[PDB]
Amino acid sequence: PYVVCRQCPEYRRQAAQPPHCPDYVCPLQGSHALCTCCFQPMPDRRVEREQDPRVAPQQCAVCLQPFCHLYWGCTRTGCYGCLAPFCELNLGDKCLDGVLNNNSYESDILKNYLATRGLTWKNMLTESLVALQRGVFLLSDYRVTGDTVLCYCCGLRSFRELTYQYRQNIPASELPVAVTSRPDCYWGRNCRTQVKAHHAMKFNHICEQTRFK
Ligand SMILES: [Zn+2]
Ligand SMILES: [Zn+2]
Ligand SMILES: [Zn+2]
Ligand SMILES: [Zn+2]
Ligand SMILES: [Zn+2]
């Protein structure tokens, strides 16, 4: 496929098929990759970067897909900045929506907790990343740190796990009594019924699956 990117040489540009009517410069032997976020081609400089840390990262270190954001700035409605060190990743203004088990009732309790104290999702992440680094909190992508360079999606995923543990560590006396009165759901955090408003309001889902007595 003929590909022309922001950094392709002018002679390549003019040689493409015309439309229908009613510092770096890509070399000839070089290849392009499509940014996973915006689908725009960029020069594929990953191999070069393996022996040259001066080249900007072009992939998520968790999922290993390519992203253009650190390389030359990505732009798309919906993209907040799709590749960044975890501690600097922009998760967007609505990152707390359904942040707990995709459960808006549990999420809103948390939002209230934070709003009450003037805390932002940012302060909460910062505090969580401290616990993570000491081994107090854990991640499924267990080797991720605040310094890991990753994508919006992989960062969001670990942010949900960290946020869950943050919520878990809030004392029951710091939450409305309307919250702490609710009985634990037998099925705990992975309950499938909690996407229904009535069940979600009635039972607490910040807990683990009930096994024996
Ligand atoms: Zn190019
Ligand atoms: Zn990723
Ligand atoms: Zn992009
Ligand atoms: Zn992007
Ligand atoms: Zn339930």
Curated annotation (Swiss-Prot):
One of its GO terms (biological process) is positive regulation of proteasomal ubiquitin-dependent protein catabolic process. GO terms for cellular component: nucleus; PML body. A zinc finger (PBZ-type) spans 183-205. The keyword Transferase applies. GO terms for molecular function: nucleotide binding; ubiquitin protein ligase activity; ubiquitin-protein transferase activity; zinc ion binding. It is found in: Nucleus, PML body. The keyword NADP does not apply. Ubiquitous. Its main location: nucleus. Changing residue 192 to A: Impairs poly(ADP-ribose)-binding and poly-ADP-ribosylation by PARP1. Keywords: ADP-ribosylation, Cell cycle, Cell division, Metal-binding, Mitosis, Nucleus, Phosphoprotein, Transferase, Ubl conjugation, Ubl conjugation pathway, Zinc, Zinc-finger. Poly-ADP-ribosylated. In addition to binding non covalently poly(ADP-ribose) via its PBZ-type zinc finger, the protein is also covalently poly-ADP-ribosylated by PARP1. Autoubiquitinated; may regulate its cellular level. It comes from the Eukaryota. The PBZ-type zinc finger (also named CYR) mediates non-covalent poly(ADP-ribose)-binding. Poly(ADP-ribose)-binding is dependent on the presence of zinc and is required for its function in antephase checkpoint. Belongs to the CHFR family. Interacts with HDAC1 and HDAC2. Interacts with PML (with sumoylated form of PML). E3 ubiquitin-protein ligase that functions in the antephase checkpoint by actively delaying passage into mitosis in response to microtubule poisons. Acts in early prophase before chromosome condensation, when the centrosome move apart from each other along the periphery of the nucleus. Probably involved in signaling the presence of mitotic stress caused by microtubule poisons by mediating the 'Lys-48'-linked ubiquitination of target proteins, leading to their degradation by the proteasome. Promotes the ubiquitination and subsequent degradation of AURKA and PLK1. CHFR is silenced in many primary cancers because of CpG methylation and deacetylated histones on its promoter region. This however raises the question of whether CHFR silencing is a consequence or a cause of primary cancers. This is E3 ubiquitin-protein ligase CHFR. It comes from Homo sapiens. The gene is CHFR. The chain holds residues 424 to 663 of 664 of the full protein.
